[PDB]
Design a binder for this molecule. Sequence first.
Ligand code: JMM
Length: 185
Amino acid sequence: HHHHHHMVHITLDRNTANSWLIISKDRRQVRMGDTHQNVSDNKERFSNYPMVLGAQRFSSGKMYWEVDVTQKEAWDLGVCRDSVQRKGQFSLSPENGFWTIWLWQDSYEAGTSPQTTLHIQVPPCQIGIFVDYEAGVVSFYNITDHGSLIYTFSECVFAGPLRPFFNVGFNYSGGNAAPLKLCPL
Ligand SMILES: O=C(c1ccco1)N1CCN(C(=O)C2CC2)CC1
């Protein structure tokens, strides 16, 4: 792909984070803590899952960023509507305002309803995410495999400003403590 020139500098929004997440001082890394991180509750925080939003809001244009997922067993990545539900249980779907892929139990899937199996021969250590607001496209790329396409959501109905979306996943196994990291331009 040739989307690299639309690179944007993404930072994480502490105020949206689940209360167990630890965001680095530079706001470029997030990981699961082993306990509540001693923050006050607010209506923006994801309550049920280890999720956080980027600070940036997109309502036009073409945007590209990269995320490091090295050594993780479980995660979700993509983009969501600023007004997604924060509290309680919900599925990741375009009907609920999410355009995402994930790793879970050694398989990769796109967050369609119902979910779609992905075909990845080279497990990615870094994921590229491309958004074309006007075209209604969200695409995912395997940076470890020379940028190969993972998945394209097309005919997207964003219906609002978009925010970068992250889930570091639970760490019930003791094998999923590693962070998500926003990779340098
Ligand atoms: O954004 C998308 C989309 C892009 C790719 C796949 O779906 N959609 C379609 C599914 N949706 C609905 O059907 C709405 C409940 C009516 C929500 C918008």
